[PDB]
Amino acid sequence: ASSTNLKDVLAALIPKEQARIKTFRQQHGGTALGQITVDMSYGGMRGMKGLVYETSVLDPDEGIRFRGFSIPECQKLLPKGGGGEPLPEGLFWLLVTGQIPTGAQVSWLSKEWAKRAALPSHVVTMLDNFPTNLHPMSQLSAAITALNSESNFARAYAEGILRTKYWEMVYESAMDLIAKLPCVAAKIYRNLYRAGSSIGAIDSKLDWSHNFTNMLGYTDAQFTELMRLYLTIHSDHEGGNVSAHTSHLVGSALSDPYLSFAAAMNGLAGPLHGLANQEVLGWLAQLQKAAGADASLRDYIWNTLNSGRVVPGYGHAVLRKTDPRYTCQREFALKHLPGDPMFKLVAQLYKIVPNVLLEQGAAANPWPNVDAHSGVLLQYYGMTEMNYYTVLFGVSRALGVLAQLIWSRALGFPLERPKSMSTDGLIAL
Amino acid sequence: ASSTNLKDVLAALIPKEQARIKTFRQQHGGTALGQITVDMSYGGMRGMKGLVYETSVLDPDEGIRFRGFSIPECQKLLPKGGGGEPLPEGLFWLLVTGQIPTGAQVSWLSKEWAKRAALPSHVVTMLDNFPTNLHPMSQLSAAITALNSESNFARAYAEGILRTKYWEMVYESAMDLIAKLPCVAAKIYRNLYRAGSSIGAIDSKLDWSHNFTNMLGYTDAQFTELMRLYLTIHSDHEGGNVSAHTSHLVGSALSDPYLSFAAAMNGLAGPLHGLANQEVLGWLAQLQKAAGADASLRDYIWNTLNSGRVVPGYGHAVLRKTDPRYTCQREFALKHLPGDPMFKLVAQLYKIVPNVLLEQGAAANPWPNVDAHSGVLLQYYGMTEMNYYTVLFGVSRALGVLAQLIWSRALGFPLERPKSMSTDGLIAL
């Protein structure tokens, strides 16, 4: 008997994994997987194997994998709206469960995320009173903190449920959070950029991406496809990235999913992280102000470097090759917006930047990362408010970090609490 | 010539340290300081040496040290208001600089934190419109996120300063943040618990703790001393604790100090972390509802355990002995509130809990941590709104995490970005 329910599948999956990780540890817990050096410690844990994070794994050379699925594999395997790009809904199923969903599974996520998307009056209030000089990432993160009022996990805990059931309330709060996100994000958009307008209603019959582009106010049918692609690829990027790691750290202490996502956002907002989104456009925007020569392009790049700034959109803590997400995005431009002058500048930069970065001899990875290519896409469709881009990253990111959050608590991962040391201390060691 | 300025001292200190860490690494960067096992990875980095954090170091047996100063040493060495307890101001100097401040230094922090304490209208607004069912930690964290509008670092970055000067703007934003904190915290207090009342003005002539207790509305002169003690001891606790680590992680991405503190708060709000403050009181509050026997006390403790809950206030990820902060607090009660029945219950619990926890055989550290003893102190003075306690922890914590934040950027610590791995991946390794 019966029909679709991710929670029921999860209920079947949790014990098996539990069992699976216990024996493995029973035989291998003592196994040394690596060493820790002084340089690693002073270096941002660079190179340290520190966390278990199941939904995605990043390879230095190949780039990110969703099961063990690459982006190109996803592109082909996840269901589409009708009509070429993968639905983030499907990606979500995949991350959570390990399996590729059927269209029908996927339609369930949509309907479910539509049913859940409702914003409480205190939140609508705050967002409406916020200043327009308050950064959109800020506005977003405060709003999601303010939603914790509603946490099902926070309430359950308060009531004293048994640890074992944590994963269950975490999942409710995760599905609700994901549902609400686009409404908060769009209300911010509308407030800042479309004063006096309203985000409108969620239509249970559309997919999450499309409802989002509706609330944003975009009509272009290719924009909708860009959206689906965007939110899918930005999903997850293994556990060690700042945003994911922050949510993992905060969530380990038993802060509900709302609070942990919000702190995640404060991390995504950093220039070295997701704000790169925005930094790239601004830097292009300056570049153009000051159709240029490779040589003038090269002078420009030098002057950034010489000034103690970074060139945004290039480099990566783990990747050592061009980000497939970058490729992914290039391939979308080549199809749809090949004559775009901003596009052409980004294509041209790919020719120079790496070379300049190899010349300088500092960046361990001179190739571009996702952020170098994403804004150019948005701008083309009319979405030119750059300080807003990171919000969109914020939205996607929720898919991966929440999908994992549920597993963490399901597997009972404890408090993340490493040892620190001071220089004096280490000097002495 | 001239008078006091922490920034000038810092300017003198930064290069030397820089130099000091470079050579050390030049000779020892390759040195293996430790190994990483599977259990560590599945275990919350328990036992992993992962971060350099200079302001404080925690010893498993002795407990926390500010330089290399213990709490008892601080108690004696830091200047006092007139009149027995150390001024958090002094502690702050100590953390930042490595040295014990003179009274006169310390008076400068006070005057400085008084000059800086000013809240922008958008923030006052939001706090005033917040619901009373929105948790105080939530209210706090949203407010500090909303303050990022004002970040001096966020602005400088935007302007493109050279990396080298980051520490300078981080310090301004840190001193401003610390200054404002008590105003935000008190406005929350006043709103939730003292409706219609106003926090009043900051008096440049008092010390930070006293202005705070004024804005809170407390008059008792011993309360003021409790406050000074509270905010000092809760200062810092090395780098690996959830809140500190979160700020370190977020700040590494170049999110301004406001954003990084806020996420820190989302971490402090977790039940396994600072919310323990509050959890302890509530659990005592239940206990009393349901002058009892050790045996009835023991039954109660069992029933929590048997129900898959934790006994709050006991256990620690690193300490292996009674927290000196706990002692510190006990010694304050014994002096001032020795007949308090809540006090007596906490004294009695110390007799039983550990034993029950040893009996159960799960907690690696059966002794109590700071949180087991702090609320009992507050309640005695009339501050009985338990859901508020963690705010106070939030306030103190700012001293340590901001003092370090400044050093991180000063020493140029890069993006924190470790590698993760999935179970499948590890299984394969």
Ligand SMILES: CC(C)(COP(=O)(O)OP(=O)(O)OC[C@H]1O[C@@H](n2cnc3c(N)ncnc32)[C@H](O)[C@@H]1OP(=O)(O)O)[C@@H](O)C(=O)NCCC(=O)NCCSCC(=O)O
């Ligand atoms: C992403 C990164 C933080 C990785 O940092 P890392 O692992 O510490 O880099 P690395 O190991 O190559 O660093 C070696 C040196 O090269 C420098 N370097 C690396 N990338 C860059 C860059 N794009 N521009 C200029 N210098 C750079 C790096 O700052 C360091 O200089 P120093 O020794 O004085 O501190 C860095 O490449 C960078 O700052 N990139 C620019 C910001 C950016 O595009 N971020 C997005 C990354 S991925 C997508 C996202 O997260 O949103």
Ligand SMILES: CC(C)(COP(=O)(O)OP(=O)(O)OC[C@H]1O[C@@H](n2cnc3c(N)ncnc32)[C@H](O)[C@@H]1OP(=O)(O)O)[C@@H](O)C(=O)NCCC(=O)NCCSCC(=O)O
């Ligand atoms: C603070 C702790 C999270 C440390 O966690 P840990 O390093 O993973 O503890 P551990 O190594 O002793 O854990 C071994 C087992 O004992 C359990 N245990 C440890 N402390 C407790 C406790 N107070 N009550 C019951 N069981 C406990 C722990 O949950 C684990 O059970 P399981 O194997 O099923 O997951 C834990 O002691 C605990 O949950 N304490 C209660 C919450 C609390 O008081 N937190 C404040 C800590 S310090 C001040 C602050 O941060 O605000």
